[PDB]
Every structure is written in structure tokens, then in C-alpha cells.
Design an enzyme around this catalytic site. Structure first.
Site, short mmCIF file in Angstrom:
data_model
loop_
_atom_site.label_atom_id
_atom_site.label_comp_id
_atom_site.label_asym_id
_atom_site.label_seq_id
_atom_site.Cartn_x
_atom_site.Cartn_y
_atom_site.Cartn_z
CB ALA A 299 -2.87 -6.45 8.08
CE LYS A 300 1.43 -7.60 5.26
NZ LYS A 300 2.63 -8.41 5.01
CG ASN A 301 3.34 0.11 7.67
OD1 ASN A 301 3.41 -1.02 8.13
ND2 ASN A 301 3.57 1.16 8.44
#
Ligand SMILES: Cc1ncc(COP(=O)(O)O)c(/C=N/[C@@H]2[C@@H](O)[C@@H](OP(=O)(O)OP(=O)(O)OC[C@H]3O[C@@H](n4cc(C)c(=O)[nH]c4=O)C[C@@H]3O)O[C@H](C)[C@H]2O)c1O
Ligand SMILES: Cc1ncc(COP(=O)(O)O)c(/C=N/[C@@H]2[C@@H](O)[C@@H](OP(=O)(O)OP(=O)(O)OC[C@H]3O[C@@H](n4cc(C)c(=O)[nH]c4=O)C[C@@H]3O)O[C@H](C)[C@H]2O)c1O
Lengths: 365, 364
Positions: A185-187
Site C-alpha cells: 500500500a505504499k507510494n
């Protein structure tokens, strides 16, 4: 209308073919640990953060821990961390024996209030971990000053800030060493658990490398009581593809938020603000309001998916009771935890979807 | 001819497409952490080790560490372990703030000598880590005997033993709990780092779980200061595919070994033997020799790949110098570490290959 809090579909779809190919490519190589993609990702990532070195590891938590360790931090050592960060920043510390000591953030930035740190420093202090929350940096220049003055190692906990800029420079190159999470779910998210350290400090790096590998620098030889926390060849491959589009997608994210920022006009909600020295990447788009659960439920009933980061404060987590803190010792983090909420903002979101959220927000009560 | 110490081709060729469909299927589902493959594999695996619970994790080192941590073990604690095992077994003890206590193995089986276990118990001792090296069981029976005698936690280190049997009972079903490594090179390898813990002990299982998840068993709440060590959905699906034929590949492995066993006869090579109560899986087919080194190089110049498992002793390792041991301190191990050596033995080796192998070996 139904709006998921987070949706990968778009960016995934977007590189599906290329991802499938990376995978087919390495599988054919039958080399899954410590190889090529590891090397090139590290090199590229380090390049991206403008620092000499990158050491991949198993997760963002691990990243921090390895850094304290490579710094030889542990028992009877203390480390400053923001009262309102993800508990992961605390474990890391605790995992070494050291003692995390909390410093409140500046509600306007959700980040550690520098002006609040010195007062936390002690004979035992060894480092400060400035977390870049939500995707925007800590006020590093000020943080810097104090670290120097006291001679503390300054570690960025940059798990939520891939590609963020502080006064024009890359998160990752602002302290002594940075830690990153590549959690899905990170950038910049891996396809699994992933993390990495970045530093200009060759020695710290070399050590950290070994520790991630059983404390070993060469075959059959173990120089430290390391562990095993590496970044799979697969994930690194996946990261290499993704890194090319980080900047690209982050600007979109920025576009969405601007849109949130112009649109929402409801008196009960405080929207989030991009620090002056910051180029926010909006890992999350947070708002605060008095009756948060209410807002949250209203939104959910409206097909709008939300999450909170985080309804429960580290010092109030049963895991940290020993410390013996209670409601009122970090009212600020306390307050925040109580009014905070994260709204959708994923790459690929459409105006209709976006307008939609603004609209239901504005129509709240 | 050229013989790779290892070689994943055969198997991977073998499953390439079903693997790829698993990958494809997961990506499409965009659910990557703590999902249905994790869940299914856990179930599948526990069943295969015939225990109640399986908790997926980061690697076999974490798996051990997790067991201990789950058992409160750590400071002012002592954990017993073979003096000749993989260092990881010891790192785990150490990560917990516990102190590893080494016990010599039975050279006959290269596995911890039970007779030797009792003389190391101290009142700080909490568990013994029995390692099932190279593909076969330590002799668990007396060990439980002992463990029970002292109220100790019996933990199997089953990282090298996927599917080996002990008196017909499955590895990982032998003590209080086992640790497995899904390092790619194992009998059951994942496509990256992977670990699993198994047990019938619900409270531990439940604890390990939360621990492995930032000490969380409920969103937003963390009860223990835990860590981040999980098994990726990807990795989990891979394994699920593999689990299916684990049994079958393991048999071929077996023939390879039996093969070597008959055919290798050279007066300076001591061939390994499978204990009576064992169903060896031959993760490693190791031989010993007084002229280990020259033999290796010899075998090498003939294009035969080998490895050493292992050349140096945990206690002789720079990492454990605080331990202040020195050669002679653990002779049995010091000895093996000097004469030991591993030869190719991988699913898919052809008759000729094997033959070429025994052939040169014989030639030495
Ligand atoms: C008793 C015990 N306890 C705990 C542990 C900890 O388990 P873990 O933390 O999950 O590693 C171990 C692990 N134990 C093993 C240890 O036995 C050792 O095995 P190894 O043969 O020395 O390691 P290897 O040289 O990487 O690979 C074996 C062959 O496989 C080939 N290969 C390898 C890879 C990775 C690849 O992608 N493609 C390949 O073709 C090349 C190699 O020749 O070192 C490993 C890192 C450990 O996981 C253990 O044995
Ligand atoms: C400051 C700081 N320091 C250290 C760390 C630790 O780094 P780590 O060890 O790598 O986790 C963090 C972690 N950061 C985060 C933390 O903020 C939190 O993020 P989260 O949004 O609350 O958890 P989530 O529900 O999985 O978040 C994303 C959404 O994305 C969807 N999703 C998720 C996955 C995994 C998927 O496969 N498919 C999906 O669709 C579901 C959810 O709606 O909890 C996570 C597990 C940590 O990784 C941090 O913020």
C-alpha cells in the site's frame, strides 16, 4: 457509488504486462535471493534518494531496527520518536533494547515538533527518528540543528514518503540514514513485504548489509549476530519497474488532493495542509473532525471507504503499558488519534468518484 | 561433464506454468499480505505435518525466534542446541536475549546427542532446539524424555527436513513446536525467503501470530511489542503448488542417495547413513574426509559442484567470540567442520550424472 479506501487496480493494470515479464524473467533465472534485481534496485533507489548507498531488507520496521543496530543502539540507550507515529517506529527501537522516548508532533503537520525535542534529550539519548507522516517531511533543518548540538544520529523514518521533497531535496537524503517500507500500500509498494535502508555512510551500510544476512560479509563466515531480513529478488524486480512511475503517479495523487483541498467546504472538518517546505506525496489524505466516528460511519454508509491512522496511540497500546502512560500524557497525539480520518486517494480515482467524496463530505450534517 | 551442486530447473520446468498461473491469479486479485493463500497454505501445511496449527512467517530463523519469543524465552534464559547446526539456529536464541548452550551431535547421525543433553541443563534452561540436519530427524524419543524430565520446551528445527519421518511420524509433529525454512534451496523452497511455524499448542500459535503481525491480533490494537515477519501471499501460493509434489520429489531424491550409497566406495570417503528410525529426505548428502579440501577441489576441477555444511563452527564464528571458546572446546563439531562436504543431489539429476559423480568419487 462505491469508493474503496485504497485500489491498486489502475496502477497494477497499468504495468501488468511489464510485471508479468519481470517475474517470468527471474523465474527463468532460478535465482531468488541476493542477486541482480537486488543490486540494480539498490543502485537505482539510492540514486533516486540521492545518497551513496541502499541496502534492501525485509520491511520498513526492519529497516529502522537495522539502522539502530548498525548504529549499535540497544539497551540503556534512548531514542526519540514522535508521539503520534505508527507503532512500527517504536517496536524497532524496543527491538534493540533501547528506549523510545516520545515527542509530540505539530498538529499542523502531523509531524514531530522540533521545538519539543531538546526537552526530551538525555544522557541516554542516542538518536532521534523523524518520521515523514502521510507523505510529507518533518522539518528537518530544525531537527538537524538539535541533533548536531547534541550529537545525535538522525534517522528518517520515511515509510510513508517515497519521492517526497523537503525544501527541494529527497526524503532519504535528509538525515544520517533513512528507512523505507515497500509494504503493498505504499507510494512505491512491493508485491509483498519489503523495505530498504539508504545512507551515504559506507560503514553503516556495510554493517547493515551483513546483519541482514546472518551477520555475514562472506561465505561461511559470520561476523555479527545478524538475522535474516532481505528483499526478495522478485520484489526488487517489481520495485524496479514501479520506480520508473513513482514520480508520475505521485503527481496524480497530488492532483487528487489539490482537488480535495479546493472542494471540501464543511465547517466541522479540518483538511490537511502541505507544509511550506514540503512537496507532499499524499500517502494518505487525512482530515480531522470532532465526531469522527460519526463522520466515518456516514461516509461508509455512503459507499465511501475510510481508515484511521491511528485511532490508538502507542503509549495507550496494551503493548506499551509498562511505560505506565495514560490518557493525558500526550493529549496532542491523543486528540489526533481521536479526531483523525483518512479518505480515499488512490491513483486512477476519477473526478466523478472524487467529486462524489467531496460532495458527501460537504453534506455531512 | 558439468554437475551443479544444485539446480532448480527440472522441478521449475516441471511446475513453471502452474506457478505462473498462481502468480497471475494473485496479482489480479491484488491482495498481497495475509490473504487466502496464506490461510490455505497454513491449513495444508499443518495437515501435512499433522499438527493443528501452522503460522506462516519470514524465514526459518524468524520461525525459531518466534517460537521462543512466544514462549517468553529471552534474557537470563538458556536454550540448548547442536554444536554443529546452522548458525541461524543460534542467532534466533540470541535475538531473544537468551543464551545458546551447545551440545555435541552423534557423529553417526550428525544430530544432537541426547545422552549429552542432560549435562548442560542449568536452572536457566528453558528449551532444547533439536535440529533435523541434512534431511533426517534427531532421535526425538529420549529427547522428549529428557525435556519432560526437566519441564523443557522441546522445539524441532525442521528447516532442512521437509517431510522426513521419524519412526514414521512427520517432522514438525515431534516436540512442542517446529520451525521450517522455505529458503529457496530447501526440499520445499519458496521463490524467496519464507518461514513457517507449526504446533498443536493453540495459545502459542495464537501468540506467534500476533507477534508476527506487529504484535497485533486485531486492527488498530497491538498487545505485544512484536515484529514484522510474515509469509507473502505470493510465496504461500507457490508453496501450495509445491506442497503437492513435495512427497514425490523427495522420493527421487531418495533414489539418488540410495544410488550413491551402493556405488560410492573409496577408502577415504565415509558415506552418510540414515538412522534406523528415519525417513531421510536428503536435503544434504554429506560425506566426510581427512583430506576434505583437496577432495573438494578435486571434485571441482571435474565440474562437480559441492558446498560445505558447514566449514566453521558456530562457536568458532567471529559472531560468538564473547563465548570465549576455542578449537578443542567442541571437538566433535571442530572435527566434522573440517572433513565434511556436500555433493550434488537434486531433483532431476540423470543416471549418467550420478554415475559421473560416483565415478570420480570412486577415482580419488
Ligand atoms: C538448521 C537451520 N536452521 C535455520 C535456518 C534458517 O532458515 P532461513 O532463515 O529461512 O534461511 C537454516 C537455513 N539454513 C541454510 C544453510 O544451510 C545454508 O544453505 P546453503 O546451501 O549454504 O545456501 P545456498 O548456498 O544459498 O544455496 C544452496 C544452493 O541453491 C542454489 N540456489 C540458491 C538460491 C537462493 C537460488 O535462488 N537459486 C539457486 O540456484 C545455489 C546454492 O548452491 O545457507 C542458507 C542461506 C540457509 O538458509 C537452517 O539450515
Ligand atoms: C511510519 C512507518 N514506519 C514503519 C512502518 C513499518 O514498515 P513495514 O514493516 O514494512 O509495514 C510503517 C508501516 N505502515 C503501515 C501502517 O500505516 C498501516 O497501513 P494500513 O493502511 O493501516 O494497513 P492496510 O489496511 O493494509 O493499508 C492499505 C489498504 O490497501 C489495501 N491492500 C493492502 C494490501 C497489503 C494488499 O495486498 N492489497 C490491498 O488492497 C487494503 C487497505 O485498504 O498498517 C500497515 C500494515 C503498515 O504497512 C510506517 O507507516
Amino acid at each position: 457509488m462505491k469508493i474503496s479506501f485504497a485500489s491498486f487496480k489502475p496502477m497494477h493494470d497499468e504495468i501488468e504486462y511489464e510485471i508479468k515479464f519481470k517475474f517470468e524473467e527471474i523465474y527463468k533465472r532460478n535465482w531468488f535471493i541476493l542477486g541482480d534485481e537486488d543490486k540494480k534496485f539498490e543502485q537505482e533507489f539510492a540514486d533516486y534518494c540521492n545518497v551513496n548507498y541502499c541496502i534492501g531488507c525485509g520491511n520498513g520496521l526492519d529497516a529502522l531496527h537495522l539502522i539502530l543496530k548498525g548504529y549499535d543502539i540497544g539497551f540503556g540507550d534512548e531514542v526519540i520518536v514522535p508521539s503520534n507515529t505508527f507503532i512500527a517506529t517504536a517496536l524497532a527501537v524496543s527491538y534493540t533494547g533501547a528506549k523510545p522516548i516520545f515527542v509530540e508532533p505539530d498538529i499542523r503537520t502531523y509531524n514531530i515538533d522540533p521545538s519539543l525535542i531538546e526537552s526530551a534529550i538525555t544522557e541516554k539519548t542516542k538518536a532521534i527518528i523523524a518520521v515523514h507522516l502521510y507523505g510529507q517531511p518533518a522539518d528537518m533543518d530544525e531537527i538537524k540543528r538539535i541533533a548536531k548540538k547534541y550529537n545525535l544520529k538522525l534517522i528518517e523514518d520515511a515509510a510513508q514518503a517515497h519521492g517526497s521533497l523537503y525544501k527541494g531535496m529527497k526524503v532519504g537524503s535528509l538525515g544520517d540514514a533513512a528507512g523505507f517500507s515497500f509494504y503493498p500500500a505504499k507510494n512505491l509498494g512491493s508485491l509483498g513485504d519489503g523495505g530498504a535502508v539508504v545512507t551515504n555512510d559506507k560503514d553503516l551500510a556495510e554493517k547493515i548489509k551483513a546483519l541482514s544476512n546472518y551477520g555475514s560479509e562472506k561465505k561461511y563466515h559470520h561476523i555479527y549476530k545478524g538475522f535474516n531480513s532481505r528483499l526478495d529478488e522478485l520484489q526488487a524486480g517489481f520495485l524496479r519497474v514501479k520506480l520508473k512511475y513513482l514520480d508520475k503517479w505521485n503527481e496524480e495523487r497530488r492532483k487528487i488532493a489539490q482537488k480535495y483541498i479546493a472542494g471540501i467546504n464543511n465547517p466541522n472538518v479540518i483538511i490537511p495542509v502541505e507544509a511550506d517546505y514540503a512537496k507532499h506525496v499524499w500517502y494518505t489524505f487525512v482530515i480531522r473532525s470532532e465526531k469522527r466516528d460519526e463522520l466515518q460511519k456516514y461516509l461508509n454508509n455512503n459507499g465511501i471507504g475510510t481508515l484511521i491512522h491511528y485511532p490508538i496511540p502507542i503509549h495507550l497500546q496494551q503493548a506499551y503499558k509498562d511505560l505506565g502512560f495514560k490518557t493525558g500524557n500526550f493529549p496532542i497525539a491523543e486528540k489526533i488519534a481521536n479526531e483523525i480520518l483518512s479518505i480515499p486517494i488512490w491513483y486512477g480515482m476519477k473526478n466523478e468518484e472524487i467529486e462524489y467524496v467531496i460532495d458527501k463530505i460537504n453534506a455531512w450534517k
